[PDB]
């Protein structure tokens, strides 16, 4: 209690407030939960606390949205298929300053609030960084006083819960709404119809899309509290409902309603399923009618010219790019605007964000698919293309190949639509997510596009919110910082720079290292308690957490681990810094290699964690079911953060940033925002290793030959042989043959080309660790220069150079 108390960044536990809090809790438990302390379960406790928290939101929520209604600002909609929201109770107490009062309140009712908090389900409505980006962004736009709205799908089931079984992943259904959701509010009043299939008739009005199937979109609003400023914004998620023999028709209502059933769990990967495209059409069509409906109920042919003055639609990826042809659909067919005015309007409303350079991430929908589901949209996409391509022709006369290259229509055996091309055509702005990425789009992927309309293209380096990702998750760190520099930094992270004044302050040095070791013990107790996993709290915590993928080179990490192990066994008496190597993250079901790689990790620990010579010198664990809430625990405890993807394949990354905020040192490549983080801190304060992008490209120019590295490196040859022969899986010697063959003959990610430098760099890291003070002073240097990686920074830029709106930090009443 005393620590929780002590922490000033957590607010006042005022006498009347704690008296009221406790009162509202009893009352909720009696009326809402229909309970007494004899029969309440912990879960009732949770729900009793959650209702009391949420009651603090309502008045603000009601009034913020009344204010938008009254004032009619320009409105920002953030359209995404994913909001990686994680839990909400701590979060709302944070931004409402209620955390220490609620803490005192509950203690006094004989209840540990942390314990109640662990009852809450995450809203795991995303797959990895774009989804989580989306959630960080709602928070910053709230904190920036913007008239912003998140728009997505209320899935039944979010990302699958991961169970490791026998060292393999087992997917279970994430039934996060089993017990209901105190956070959401049903909005029946705003249910809309969405039309699927049917056909198009050209009449004297124009076109008319007839004989369609109808699914209803039912919205559920969720409050988005800003930091301590009396703003509460909404996320609105749509859920599919069937319109209003005999038994079999009712049972078959499930078919329409399966559109919001389940997040597709393919991160960084296009699988072209029709159910996925219905998901995408669903959210798009409902959001844009709701949008056009608000526009209609606000100011005032007057109207639609001004529509881009009144509306911004941000496309998170190409997942809601049907926004473009739908907007046009409405304007042209329904509103009867002329094609050219309607196109002017669209391009002024819409901007697109790219998250990936990987070609296997791009959405390219078979036209037959689109032609059946969405006959009218296809026609509009053809008209869009034609006229766009007439523009390329005019600018590059005779450049026929360029026509073929820029076309939204991919020729082939299967015709398909390039959803990225679509998006660049129909948006006034196209961004990447970090300085290098946005250069490569301009230099490569969208090079011809850039030449056309160079003013379209921008950079918006990612951030993370310093509420969830420092104040919530690392209240310790948060508190020793506020102690020196006060509390303003929490929504002005650039204030962190002030901590460079403390690099040679003995109490600061001491406190920082104290806080991390405090977090290491907590994490280590979590592992015992929840998973009976025993780890060394006096070791280097080396963490790689992120979805499992080949580009991400969990495999290069595993080679480092087996090197460490093999060196020990060679010189057993020789000293080494003790490590706990933690690898966590989910594989897409059906990503065979990624599932292979999880299995190899746990296989490495089966060996490594049982060698008596090794003892407590090295330990390998796979952290089960990595999610937002799990992030919030292991990130504040890590010493080293692994950011090891091949140069040029991680667009930005954001995990990098969370680990920076919270006092880990980074081993990485110059990739994504790792480059800007090295810039911030100075490269003298990072562990940058291996190829730059230019060295990958030179490798590709002449040919990656994995065997060249094999033949030259006896250490890498010892491990390959281990893997082949069955050292890591004796009961099935041939188990890792597809890992080996990929590494040997088909590695698109060049793992062996970065091997020798990664291991030498890891040498450097452990040398620094053997001097605590100097570790802690470089850490200081890292924390101190992470303020650029706040999402307030990122969002203020989107507002000023895309949405064409001014941010704010003036408190509402």
Ligand X SMILES: O=C(Nc1ccc(Oc2ccc(C(=O)O)c(C(=O)O)c2)c(NC(=O)c2cccc([N+](=O)[O-])c2)c1)c1cccc([N+](=O)[O-])c1
546 among known catalytic residues: yes
Residue 640 near residue 543, CB atoms below 8 Å: yes
CB of 89 to ligand X, least distance (A): 18
Could you tell me which stretch among 30-38, 135-143, 382-390, 669-677 binds ligand X (CB under 6 A)?
A: 30-38
Residues 15, 23, 30, 39: which binds ligand X (CB under 6 A)? 39
38 near ligand X, rule: CB under 6 A: yes
**One of 75, 364, 421, 547 is an active-site residue; which one?**
547
808 near ligand X, rule: CB under 6 A: no
- Return d(Cα 644, Cα 557) in angstroms, integer: 8
Q: Contact letters (x/-) for ligand X, 140-179, by CB under 6 A?
A: ----------------------------------------
Map residue 313 onto helix, strand or coil.
strand
400 binds, among ligand X, a second copy, none (CB under 5 to 8 A by kind): none
Residues contacting residue 559 through CB under 8 Å, at least 6 positions apart: 716, 719, 751, 755, 758
Task: Tell me if 595 is assigned to a ligand binding site.
Answer: no
CB of 137 to a second copy, least distance (A): 23
Task: Tell me if 704 is assigned to a ligand binding site.
Answer: no
CA angle (308, 324, 422) in 5-degree steps: 125
CB of 398 to a second copy, least distance (A): 47
**One of 416, 617, 658, 793 is an active-site residue; which one?**
658
- Return d(Cα 345, Cα 325) in angstroms, integer: 12
Q: How many CB atoms sit inside 10 A of residue 152's CB?
A: 26
Q: What are the tokens at 304?
A: 């639609």
Beta bridge partners of 459: 432
Q: Contact letters (x/-) for ligand X, 283-322, by CB under 6 A?
A: -----------x--x-------------------------
294 binds, among a second copy, ligand X, none (CB under 5 to 8 A by kind): ligand X
User: Can you tell me which residue has the tokens 């620590």?
Assistant: 3
143 among known catalytic residues: no
List phi, psi (to 5°) of 778. -75, -30
User: Closer CB to a second copy, residue 221 or residue 363?
Assistant: 221
User: Closer CB to ligand X, residue 62 or residue 613?
Assistant: 62
253 binds, among ligand X, a second copy, none (CB under 5 to 8 A by kind): a second copy
69 near ligand X, rule: CB under 6 A: yes
34 near ligand X, rule: CB under 6 A: yes
Task: Tell me if 299 is assigned to a ligand binding site.
Answer: yes
61 near ligand X, rule: CB under 6 A: yes
Q: Strand order of the sheet with strand 687-688?
A: 618-623, 579-584, 540-545, 640-643, 665-668, 687-688
Task: Tell me if 22 is assigned to a ligand binding site.
Answer: no
Last residue before each break in the chain (C–N > 2.5 Å): 244, 300
- In terms of phi and psi (left: phi > 0; alpha: psi -120 to 50; beta: otherwise), the region of 97 is left
If we measure between CA atoms, which residue out of 81, 59, 235 comes closest to residue 148?
235
Task: Tell me if 627 is assigned to a ligand binding site.
Answer: no
CB of 54 to a second copy, least distance (A): 8
**One of 54, 376, 468, 552 is an active-site residue; which one?**
552
Radius of gyration of the chain measured on its C-alpha atoms: 27
Element at 172 (helix H, strand E): strand 168-172
- Return d(Cα 650, Cα 309) in angstroms, integer: 35
Instruction: Please give the residue ranges that form the binding site for a second copy (CB under 8 A).
Output: 30-31, 34-36, 41, 43, 55, 58-59, 61-62, 66, 157, 160, 171-173, 175, 178-180, 185-186, 188-189, 221, 241-242, 244-247, 249-251, 253-254, 258, 261-262, 264-265, 273, 275, 589-590
666 among known catalytic residues: no
60 among known catalytic residues: no
User: Closer CB to a second copy, residue 261 or residue 435?
Assistant: 261
Residues 221, 280, 639, 747: which binds ligand X (CB under 6 A)? 221
Q: What torsion do the CA atoms of 541, 545, 551, 557 make, to the nearest 10 degrees?
A: 20
525 binds, among a second copy, ligand X, none (CB under 5 to 8 A by kind): none
Residues 62, 255, 507, 767: which binds ligand X (CB under 6 A)? 62
37 near ligand X, rule: CB under 6 A: yes
Q: What are the tokens at 459?
A: 């950079």
Q: What are the tokens at 538?
A: 């006096």
Q: What are the tokens at 371?
A: 């032609």
Residue 99 near residue 11, CB atoms below 8 Å: yes
355 among known catalytic residues: yes
Residues contacting residue 43 through CB under 8 Å, at least 6 positions apart: 119, 179
Residues contacting residue 676 through CB under 8 Å, at least 6 positions apart: 434, 435, 461, 788, 789
CA 329 to chain CA centroid, Å, is 31
Q: What is the largest CA-CA distance in the chain?
A: 89
Instruction: Using CB under 6 A, list all residues that contact ligand X.
Output: 34-39, 61-62, 65-66, 68-69, 185, 221, 294, 297
Please state the residue numbers annotated as binding site for AMP. 36, 69, 293-300
Please state the residue numbers annotated as binding site. 36, 69, 293-300
Residues catalogued as catalytic: 355, 546-547, 552, 654, 658
């Amino acid at each position: 209690q005393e620590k929780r108390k002590q922490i000033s960044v957590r607010g006042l536990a005022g006498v009347e407030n704690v008296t009221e809090l406790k009162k509202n809790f009893n009352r909720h438990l009696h009326f809402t939960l229909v309970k007494d302390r004899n029969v309440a379960t912990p879960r009732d406790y949770y729900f009793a606390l959650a209702h009391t928290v949420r009651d603090h939101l309502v008045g603000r929520w009601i009034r913020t949205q009344q204010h938008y209604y009254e004032k009619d600002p320009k409105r920002i909609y953030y359209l995404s298929l994913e909001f990686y929201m994680g839990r909400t109770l701590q979060n709302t107490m944070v931004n409402l300053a209620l955390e220490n009062a609620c803490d005192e309140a509950t203690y006094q009712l004989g209840l540990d609030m942390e314990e109640l908090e662990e009852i809450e389900e995450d809203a795991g409505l995303g797959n990895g960084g774009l989804g989580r980006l989306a959630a960080c962004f709602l928070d910053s736009m709230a904190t920036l006083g913007l008239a912003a709205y998140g728009y997505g799908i209320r899935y039944e089931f979010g990302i699958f819960n991961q169970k490791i079984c026998g060292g393999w992943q087992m997917e279970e259904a994430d039934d996060w709404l089993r017990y209901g959701n105190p956070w959401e509010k049903a909005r029946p009043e705003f249910t809309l119809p969405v039309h699927f299939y049917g056909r198009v008739e050209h009449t004297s009005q124009g076109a008319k899309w007839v004989d369609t199937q109808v699914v209803l979109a039912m919205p559920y609003d969720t409050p988005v509290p800003g930091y301590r400023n009396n703003v509460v914004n909404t996320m609105r998620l749509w859920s599919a409902k069937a319109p209003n023999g005999y038994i079999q028709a009712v049972l078959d209502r499930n078919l329409a309603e399966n559109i919001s059933r389940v997040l597709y769990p393919n991160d960084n990967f296009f699988e072209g399923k029709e159910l996925r495209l219905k998901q995408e059409y669903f959210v798009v069509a409902a959001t844009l009618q709701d949008i056009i409906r608000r526009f209609k109920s606000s100011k005032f042919r007057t109207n639609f010219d001004a529509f881009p003055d009144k509306v911004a639609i941000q496309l998170n990826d190409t997942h809601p790019s049907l926004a473009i042809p739908e907007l046009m659909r409405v304007l042209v067919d329904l509103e009867r605007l002329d094609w050219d005015k309607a196109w002017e309007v669209t391009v002024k409303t819409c901007a697109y964000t790219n998250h990936t350079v990987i070609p296997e991430a791009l959405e390219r929908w078979p036209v037959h698919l689109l032609e059946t589901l969405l006959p009218r949209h296809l026609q509009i996409i053809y008209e869009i293309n034609q006229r766009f391509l007439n523009r390329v022709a005019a600018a590059f006369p005779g450049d026929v190949d360029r026509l073929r290259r820029m076309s939204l229509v991919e020729e082939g055996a299967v015709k398909r639509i390039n959803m990225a091309h679509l998006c660049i055509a129909g948006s006034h702005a196209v961004n990447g997510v970090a300085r290098i990425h946005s250069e490569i789009l301009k230099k490569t992927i969208f090079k011809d596009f850039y030449e056309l309309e160079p003013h379209k293209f921008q950079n918006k380096t990612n951030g993370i919110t310093p509420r969830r990702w420092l104040v919530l998750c690392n209240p310790g760190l948060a508190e020793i910082i506020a102690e020196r520099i006060g509390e303003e930094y929490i929504s002005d992270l650039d204030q962190l720079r002030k901590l460079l004044s403390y690099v040679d302050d003995e109490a600061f040095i001491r406190d920082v290292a104290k806080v991390k070791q405090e977090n290491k013990l907590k994490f280590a107790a979590y592992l015992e308690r929840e998973y009976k996993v025993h780890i060394n709290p006096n070791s280097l915590f080396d963490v790689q957490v992120k979805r499992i993928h080949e580009y991400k080179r969990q495999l290069l990490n595993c080679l480092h681990v087996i090197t460490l192990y093999n060196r020990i066994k060679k010189e057993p008496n020789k000293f080494v810094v003790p490590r706990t190597v933690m690898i966590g993250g989910k594989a897409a079901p059906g990503y065979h290699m990624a599932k292979m790689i999880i299995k190899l990790i746990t296989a490495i620990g089966d060996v490594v964690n049982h060698d008596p010579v090794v003892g407590d010198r090295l330990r390998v664990i796979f952290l089960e079911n990595y999610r937002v809430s799990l992030a919030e625990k292991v990130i504040p405890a890590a010493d080293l953060s692994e950011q090891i993807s091949t140069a040029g394949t991680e667009a930005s990354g954001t995990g990098n940033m969370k680990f920076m905020l919270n006092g880990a040192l980074t081993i990485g490549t110059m990739d994504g925002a790792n480059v800007e983080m090295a810039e911030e801190a100075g490269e003298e304060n990072f562990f940058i290793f291996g190829m730059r992008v230019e060295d990958v490209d030179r490798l590709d120019q002449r040919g990656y030959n994995a065997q060249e590295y094999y033949d030259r490196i006896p250490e890498l040859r010892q491990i390959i042989e281990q893997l082949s022969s069955g050292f890591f899986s004796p009961k099935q010697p041939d188990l890792f043959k597809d890992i080996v063959n990929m590494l040997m003959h088909h590695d698109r990610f060049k793992v062996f080309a970065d091997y020798e430098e990664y291991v030498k760099c890891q040498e450097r890291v452990s040398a620094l660790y053997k001097n605590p003070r100097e570790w802690t002073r470089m850490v200081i240097r890292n924390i101190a220069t992470s303020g650029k990686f706040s999402s307030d920074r990122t969002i203020a830029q989107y507002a000023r150079e895309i949405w064409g709106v001014e941010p704010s930090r003036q408190r509402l009443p």
